[PDB]
Amino acid sequence: MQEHYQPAAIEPAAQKKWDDARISNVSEDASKPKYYCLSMFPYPSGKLHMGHVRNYTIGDVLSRFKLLNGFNVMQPMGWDAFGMPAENAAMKNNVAPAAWTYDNIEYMKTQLKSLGFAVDWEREVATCKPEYYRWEQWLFTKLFEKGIVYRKNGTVNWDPVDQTVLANEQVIDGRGWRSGALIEKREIPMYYFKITDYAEELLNDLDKLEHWPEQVKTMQRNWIGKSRGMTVRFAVSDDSKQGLEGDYAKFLQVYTTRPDTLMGATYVAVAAEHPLATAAAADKPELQAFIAECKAGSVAEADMATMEKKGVPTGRYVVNPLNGDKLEVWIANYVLWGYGDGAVMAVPAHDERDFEFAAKYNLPKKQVIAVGDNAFDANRWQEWYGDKENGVLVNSGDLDGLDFQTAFDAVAAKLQSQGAGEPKTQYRLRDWGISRQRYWGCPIPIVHCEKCGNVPVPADQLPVVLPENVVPDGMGSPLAKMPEFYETSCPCCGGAAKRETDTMDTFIESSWYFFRYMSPKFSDGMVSAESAKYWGAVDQYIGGIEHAILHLLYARFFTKLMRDEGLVNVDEPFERLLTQGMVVCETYYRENDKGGKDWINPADVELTGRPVSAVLKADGLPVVISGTEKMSKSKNNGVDPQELINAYGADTARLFMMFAAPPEQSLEWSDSGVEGAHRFLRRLWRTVYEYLKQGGAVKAFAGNQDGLSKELKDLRHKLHSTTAKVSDDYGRRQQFNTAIAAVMELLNQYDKTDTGSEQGRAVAQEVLEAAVRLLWPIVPHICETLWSELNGAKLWEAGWPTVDEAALVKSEIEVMVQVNGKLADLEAAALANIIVVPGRLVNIVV
């Protein structure tokens, strides 16, 4: 054994040992219990970043832990390869997105392998290969003919300078993010998944997920946004019907989740597109401009609640069907056409948004709910105003005294008998638009024929192959400019026809890849029945919290779609979910020509016992230290993991990632932290080397520990309590820094114990054999190497250390007490119950 720890001399040999034994290449073997541990697969962007290393180390710790506990562990990796990065890189560098993608995959794969992740590379997938995306085209066609996928005109933001469609997030003050040109709202035909048909299943099945964080489930419930409410129709006043047609001349229909407060409505609000808004605006230029501003907005959903709420009165009035009050109709910017009736009622006394709106415009507020003897003040909002559980109706005529639910049914009865309303269930959830006006994505398998309509491509003809010999230019979607691609024959009639040129939302690839891993070479379906039956669901899923809403909802949706097609038998794709935080780092800059700053990478900086100023490495001139935030290209504060691997090895990188913070926490990049991790690995190496240099390996202590010395019994207690702590950390708490600190405490106590005797060496052997197996999920290369110096058996066959319960029992007390012959540590306790015979009796002489 070499005296000093040198990761470059051991880490490649360990990887070759694991690869040779094929420990990570698993099959559908019903002889060992399966465990499917999955980390969210990456975009092949070019190189790994620190978020990748954190994520896939966490996954590897859990996988190797289950491996050592005897599970048949699948840990697959692959590449989420479609999307805009490759298109951007294509325009910047004049290379094909496919070629750029495949180069990145090869480089990143090498990086992953060098980190020693126990990955089944025989299950690798690349979602931009036709062998992958043919199966989501297939599923698309199946759902399209069922109507679960449909085609419908929708509104997009068109950038006329960049000649491309922009998400609301790419619109700033009505202008494209890069071009700066005013965007144009355009109606175009697009394809949609009818995810609203599955809204109740997706909401209710969340309750099955007892091993999901409550916040993720809460966020999905809020996103689905089910409400049980009331349709209410307010008759339009006889003086307010000019310009209105149909039922819009007769009534204004609204949806409310608080019909118990209907007696307290003081106005109503309609969307900019509502026929009442149109009719009132016909001769009022201020309303026309207000409607035009609402339509021109591009507010992202995560920002909808933060936008300033504004409205205009219309001069039109409706009648409250309960109390007869004549209420003025406002146009408001928070009322969205397409949600419900595009019209709401306002109760400023019991809805905070209505309160602020009414306060802005001095609109009335009528209290109709009371909670105890609390004071109602129309000038200041109190939280109890919105209370639904503990409230009673007031100022509501014959409804006074009722609680929420009884008032709800009473209002339902009253409205239903009048014909003015009825209970109704709504969902905030929108259907899933999947059309993308981009090249580097899965072609939509539809052919347009003037005789036959939108025709799905038959299954024998799939895939529709995206041509890879393309270099996007930035003057429109390439596929729309390629007749060699879109000109075709109709598969129903053989006539002249045109392929769909839009591609799929790349969330589609990530909505089913975890099933594809089960049979990644199966050419007769999305996933073979034998492999889906064996692997079932993902036991452990690990990834960033930023995917808690959309990706997870889409994956749960695709699982239920695939279940309903008969391809799988699970209702839910992911049993346990571990969400990881972000990686942050200090930022550095040098001040600019024009009162700005230019940001310098941390590795290209060197700081100067208390550190002071930082300077550039190449020259030594000073740099400005700035704030700590998430690693990004924006402020040039990303630390390349390849440099961390180059400087210290894979094991140090993995150890620092796991010791620095729990998975959910932000992980701060720390030079001293990385050095601390490396020094601990040196220490572990030194401990085994010094142990072996003074006598070589012995049979580890096992069995009855009667006759062991007090000090060695104490070390065995620390040992098996550590094994218990670590197992509970990996298996239950999924907090790995405390598992590391626990082994550190074991090694500390070992360091303070004389293990030089025959029995001492056998306990030291037991200690070290456990410590390297406890740490092998985190730092497998050094532990694999050290284990082989301690013991000749296969480490993965020796398995996870077992807790010796006998080592955890205390030394016992048993003696008699006698005051005047009648029934320090023993004198102190029997006094709580001065002659004492050693160990047998005590006698309290008094």
Ligand SMILES: CC(C)C[C@H](N)C(=O)NS(=O)(=O)OC[C@H]1OC[C@@H](CCCn2cc(-c3ccc(OC(F)(F)F)cc3)nn2)[C@H](O)[C@@H]1O
């Ligand atoms: C399932 C599928 C939808 C997943 C999809 N293909 C995807 O998200 N793919 S992915 O490749 O983006 O991420 C693959 C996984 O692992 C990384 C996780 C990132 C956690 C947050 N986070 C980012 C960073 C960070 C960024 C840049 C840096 O470099 C710099 F820019 F140079 F600075 C340095 C650090 N730190 N922390 C991610 O959540 C996912 O679980």
Ligand SMILES: [Mg+2]
């Ligand atoms: Mg259950």
Ligand SMILES: [Zn+2]
């Ligand atoms: Zn046809």
